[PDB]
Design an enzyme around this catalytic site. Structure first.
Site, PDB file in Angstrom:
ATOM      1  N   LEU A 158      -7.490 -10.962   7.524  1.00  0.00           N
ATOM      2  CA  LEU A 158      -7.637  -9.645   6.919  1.00  0.00           C
ATOM      3  C   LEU A 158      -7.050  -9.538   5.514  1.00  0.00           C
ATOM      4  O   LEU A 158      -7.281  -8.559   4.795  1.00  0.00           O
ATOM      5  CB  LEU A 158      -6.968  -8.599   7.806  1.00  0.00           C
ATOM      6  CG  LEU A 158      -7.143  -8.715   9.316  1.00  0.00           C
ATOM      7  CD1 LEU A 158      -6.376  -7.581   9.982  1.00  0.00           C
ATOM      8  CD2 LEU A 158      -8.609  -8.668   9.687  1.00  0.00           C
TER       9      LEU A 158
ATOM     10  N   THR B  69      -4.903 -12.124   2.230  1.00  0.00           N
ATOM     11  CA  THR B  69      -4.280 -13.365   1.791  1.00  0.00           C
ATOM     12  C   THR B  69      -3.478 -13.181   0.513  1.00  0.00           C
ATOM     13  O   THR B  69      -3.690 -12.218  -0.232  1.00  0.00           O
ATOM     14  CB  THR B  69      -5.321 -14.407   1.492  1.00  0.00           C
ATOM     15  OG1 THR B  69      -4.666 -15.628   1.162  1.00  0.00           O
ATOM     16  CG2 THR B  69      -6.162 -13.966   0.314  1.00  0.00           C
TER      17      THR B  69
ATOM     18  N   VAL C 128      -4.652  -2.287  12.695  1.00  0.00           N
ATOM     19  CA  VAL C 128      -5.118  -1.020  12.130  1.00  0.00           C
ATOM     20  C   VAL C 128      -6.582  -1.155  11.773  1.00  0.00           C
ATOM     21  O   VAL C 128      -6.916  -1.396  10.617  1.00  0.00           O
ATOM     22  CB  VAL C 128      -4.362  -0.680  10.848  1.00  0.00           C
ATOM     23  CG1 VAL C 128      -4.774   0.688  10.354  1.00  0.00           C
ATOM     24  CG2 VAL C 128      -2.875  -0.730  11.108  1.00  0.00           C
TER      25      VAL C 128
ATOM     26  N   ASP D 283       7.402  -1.040  -2.677  1.00  0.00           N
ATOM     27  CA  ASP D 283       6.102  -1.633  -2.970  1.00  0.00           C
ATOM     28  C   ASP D 283       4.939  -0.805  -2.458  1.00  0.00           C
ATOM     29  O   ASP D 283       4.132  -1.274  -1.661  1.00  0.00           O
ATOM     30  CB  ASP D 283       6.017  -3.059  -2.410  1.00  0.00           C
ATOM     31  CG  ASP D 283       4.765  -3.822  -2.903  1.00  0.00           C
ATOM     32  OD1 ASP D 283       4.106  -3.365  -3.881  1.00  0.00           O
ATOM     33  OD2 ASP D 283       4.462  -4.888  -2.308  1.00  0.00           O
TER      34      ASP D 283
ATOM     35  N   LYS E 256       1.400   0.981  -2.735  1.00  0.00           N
ATOM     36  CA  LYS E 256       0.133   0.781  -3.438  1.00  0.00           C
ATOM     37  C   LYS E 256      -1.019   0.878  -2.448  1.00  0.00           C
ATOM     38  O   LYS E 256      -0.881   0.477  -1.297  1.00  0.00           O
ATOM     39  CB  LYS E 256       0.088  -0.584  -4.157  1.00  0.00           C
ATOM     40  CG  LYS E 256       0.211  -1.817  -3.272  1.00  0.00           C
ATOM     41  CD  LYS E 256       0.183  -3.081  -4.121  1.00  0.00           C
ATOM     42  CE  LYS E 256       0.523  -4.333  -3.308  1.00  0.00           C
ATOM     43  NZ  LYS E 256       0.469  -5.606  -4.090  1.00  0.00           N
TER      44      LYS E 256
ATOM     45  N   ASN F 219      -1.756  -1.364   0.159  1.00  0.00           N
ATOM     46  CA  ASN F 219      -0.804  -1.451   1.250  1.00  0.00           C
ATOM     47  C   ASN F 219      -0.843  -0.338   2.278  1.00  0.00           C
ATOM     48  O   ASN F 219      -0.078  -0.372   3.233  1.00  0.00           O
ATOM     49  CB  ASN F 219       0.611  -1.607   0.695  1.00  0.00           C
ATOM     50  CG  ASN F 219       0.904  -3.035   0.256  1.00  0.00           C
ATOM     51  OD1 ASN F 219       0.034  -3.920   0.335  1.00  0.00           O
ATOM     52  ND2 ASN F 219       2.132  -3.272  -0.202  1.00  0.00           N
TER      53      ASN F 219
ATOM     54  N   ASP G  82       3.519  -3.928   4.639  1.00  0.00           N
ATOM     55  CA  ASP G  82       4.242  -4.687   3.624  1.00  0.00           C
ATOM     56  C   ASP G  82       5.638  -4.150   3.337  1.00  0.00           C
ATOM     57  O   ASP G  82       5.809  -3.260   2.507  1.00  0.00           O
ATOM     58  CB  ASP G  82       3.462  -4.726   2.307  1.00  0.00           C
ATOM     59  CG  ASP G  82       3.746  -5.973   1.515  1.00  0.00           C
ATOM     60  OD1 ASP G  82       4.875  -6.482   1.596  1.00  0.00           O
ATOM     61  OD2 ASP G  82       2.848  -6.457   0.807  1.00  0.00           O
TER      62      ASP G  82
ATOM     63  N   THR H 145       4.588  -3.842  -7.699  1.00  0.00           N
ATOM     64  CA  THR H 145       3.302  -4.137  -8.321  1.00  0.00           C
ATOM     65  C   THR H 145       3.371  -3.478  -9.686  1.00  0.00           C
ATOM     66  O   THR H 145       3.867  -2.368  -9.816  1.00  0.00           O
ATOM     67  CB  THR H 145       2.112  -3.568  -7.499  1.00  0.00           C
ATOM     68  OG1 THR H 145       1.908  -4.379  -6.334  1.00  0.00           O
ATOM     69  CG2 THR H 145       0.830  -3.580  -8.317  1.00  0.00           C
TER      70      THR H 145
HETATM   71  N1  LIG Z   1      -0.710  -6.886  -1.117  1.00  0.00           N
HETATM   72  C1  LIG Z   1      -1.194  -7.475   0.116  1.00  0.00           C
HETATM   73  C2  LIG Z   1      -0.073  -7.396   1.139  1.00  0.00           C
HETATM   74  O1  LIG Z   1      -0.711  -7.008   2.324  1.00  0.00           O
HETATM   75  C3  LIG Z   1       0.048  -6.847   3.500  1.00  0.00           C
HETATM   76  C4  LIG Z   1       1.457  -7.057   3.637  1.00  0.00           C
HETATM   77  N2  LIG Z   1       2.142  -6.872   4.802  1.00  0.00           N
HETATM   78  C5  LIG Z   1       1.485  -6.454   5.933  1.00  0.00           C
HETATM   79  C6  LIG Z   1       0.078  -6.216   5.907  1.00  0.00           C
HETATM   80  N3  LIG Z   1      -0.640  -5.785   7.014  1.00  0.00           N
HETATM   81  C7  LIG Z   1      -2.022  -5.544   7.013  1.00  0.00           C
HETATM   82  C8  LIG Z   1      -2.625  -5.070   8.301  1.00  0.00           C
HETATM   83  C9  LIG Z   1      -1.785  -4.882   9.414  1.00  0.00           C
HETATM   84  C10 LIG Z   1      -2.326  -4.426  10.623  1.00  0.00           C
HETATM   85  N4  LIG Z   1      -3.654  -4.154  10.784  1.00  0.00           N
HETATM   86  C11 LIG Z   1      -4.467  -4.337   9.714  1.00  0.00           C
HETATM   87  C12 LIG Z   1      -3.998  -4.787   8.465  1.00  0.00           C
HETATM   88  C13 LIG Z   1      -2.740  -5.752   5.821  1.00  0.00           C
HETATM   89  C14 LIG Z   1      -2.055  -6.185   4.659  1.00  0.00           C
HETATM   90  C15 LIG Z   1      -0.642  -6.422   4.678  1.00  0.00           C
HETATM   91  C16 LIG Z   1      -1.716  -8.910  -0.172  1.00  0.00           C
HETATM   92  C17 LIG Z   1      -0.691 -10.032  -0.225  1.00  0.00           C
HETATM   93  C18 LIG Z   1      -0.082 -10.468  -1.387  1.00  0.00           C
HETATM   94  N5  LIG Z   1       0.789 -11.486  -1.100  1.00  0.00           N
HETATM   95  C19 LIG Z   1       0.758 -11.727   0.260  1.00  0.00           C
HETATM   96  C20 LIG Z   1       1.480 -12.668   0.994  1.00  0.00           C
HETATM   97  C21 LIG Z   1       1.291 -12.737   2.400  1.00  0.00           C
HETATM   98  C22 LIG Z   1       0.375 -11.856   3.054  1.00  0.00           C
HETATM   99  C23 LIG Z   1      -0.363 -10.898   2.300  1.00  0.00           C
HETATM  100  C24 LIG Z   1      -0.166 -10.827   0.853  1.00  0.00           C
END
Ligand SMILES: N[C@H](COc1cncc2nc(-c3ccncc3)ccc12)Cc1c[nH]c2ccccc12
Lengths: 20, 336
Positions: free
Chosen positions: B35, B37, B109, B152, B154, B157, B170, B187
């Site tokens: 979902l 990266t 989610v 953080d 945004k 997020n 996040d 950010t």
């Molecule tokens: N800004 C983004 C961060 O996104 C996330 C950070 N933490 C929990 C997160 N959970 C979800 C999520 C959780 C549960 N259901 C659906 C989606 C989506 C994005 C997340 C992309 C990103 C930048 N560096 C990373 C390093 C590791 C993983 C994601 C990222």
């Protein structure tokens, strides 16, 4: 339009966070 | 509220002091999709056999964390996350590690990223933007109340659950701090002035970021943007914001005070705390109690076509989860 300028800009995608 | 937050402080504090550990194994889950990266990790949509449930599983590369000097932030993330609890925060069901990774299995989610919606759509009606703001608003009340700075915020997020509400994710920069902090992070476009001007700062930045969110939810774009970060930081510390034509009077008002460079005049860090936000004209139509109870009328119900559906998330090249035959960063992560 500001909205126009925004789309031509390379910052309309998922913005990454800044670390070090 | 006051009566509530207290109870919450004791609850948080108890979990915070004796945080859980190794609550599961990787091989207990079933990989399905990526979902999201990034930097040192990726998040997958996973299935938990024993119960047949789904969860998002944040996977952190221990060595990639060490290189980017994020060891301290990753520990904060897990610690705060397992200790916290609120109607608009993703629950952290499980967490563990192995020779190569750190794992945080969160609640799935199905709704996707706010960001994904606000871009396809363009902008949000003030009633729609305000709906989300409010939630972020309370959540910030909860967090701050526990000496926690999110740091953080945004669109990328904020996720949207079935009912159409926000689910802050996040907590990579979440930190339990009483008093000034200097850790430079977040950010760009949402950075507070203080943070860029390296002058130590407090929660006051969580409200500035808030004002930034709202602006972007109501306008379609950030009040401070350009092609390169320097450019943007230069716009933020300039102290010159420009609002669209369709921004009501009240809104332009609430925004002016939040995007306040003067943090002795910035709504939130003031003498009346967060009520300066809950009691603003632009928010009068808002019933803060109705929101906390998820009883308000979600202005947008992101609908999915079935558990595991993921048509609301973008696609990412699936990668592999390999764990070396040897432990990698033992004592650097001993308390995860
Ligand atoms: N800004 C983004 C961060 O996104 C996330 C950070 N933490 C929990 C997160 N959970 C979800 C999520 C959780 C549960 N259901 C659906 C989606 C989506 C994005 C997340 C992309 C990103 C930048 N560096 C990373 C390093 C590791 C993983 C994601 C990222």
């Amino acid at each position: 339009t500001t909205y126009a300028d925004f789309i031509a800009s390379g910052r309309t995608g998922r913005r990454n966070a800044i670390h070090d | 509220v006051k009566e509530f937050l207290a109870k919450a402080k004791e609850d948080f504090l108890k979990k915070w002091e004796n945080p859980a550990q190794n609550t599961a194994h990787l091989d207990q889950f079933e990989r399905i999709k990526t979902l999201g990266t990034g930097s040192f990790g990726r998040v997958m949509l996973v299935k938990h056999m024993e119960t047949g449930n789904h969860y998002a599983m944040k996977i952190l590369d221990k060595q990639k964390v060490v290189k980017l000097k994020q060891i301290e932030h990753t520990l904060n993330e897990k610690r705060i996350l397992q200790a916290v609890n609120f109607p608009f925060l993703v629950k952290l069901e499980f967490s563990f590690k192995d020779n190569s990774n750190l794992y945080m299995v969160m609640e799935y989610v199905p709704g996707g990223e706010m960001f994904s919606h606000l871009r396809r759509i363009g902008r949000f009606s003030e009633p729609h933007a305000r709906f989300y703001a409010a939630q972020i608003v309370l959540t910030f009340e909860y967090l701050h109340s526990l000496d926690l700075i999110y740091r953080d915020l945004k669109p990328e997020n904020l996720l949207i659950d079935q009912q159409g509400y926000i689910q802050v994710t996040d907590f990579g920069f979440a930190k339990r701090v009483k008093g000034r902090t200097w850790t430079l992070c977040g950010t760009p476009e949402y950075l507070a002035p203080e943070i860029i001007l390296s002058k130590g700062y407090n929660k006051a930045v969580d409200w500035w970021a808030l004002g930034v969110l709202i602006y972007e939810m109501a306008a379609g774009y950030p009040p401070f943007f350009a092609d390169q970060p320097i450019q943007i930081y230069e716009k933020i510390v300039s102290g010159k914001v420009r609002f669209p034509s369709h921004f009501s009077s009240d809104l332009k008002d609430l925004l002016r005070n939040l995007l306040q460079v003067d943090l002795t005049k910035r709504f939130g860090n003031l003498k009346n705390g967060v009520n300066d936000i809950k009691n603003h004209k632009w928010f009068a139509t808002t019933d803060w109690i109705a929101i906390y109870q998820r009883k308000v009328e979600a202005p947008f119900i992101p609908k999915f076509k079935g558990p595991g559906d993921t048509s609301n998330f973008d696609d990412y090249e699936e990668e592999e989860i390999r764990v070396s035959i040897n432990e990698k960063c033992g004592k650097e992560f001993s308390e995860f």
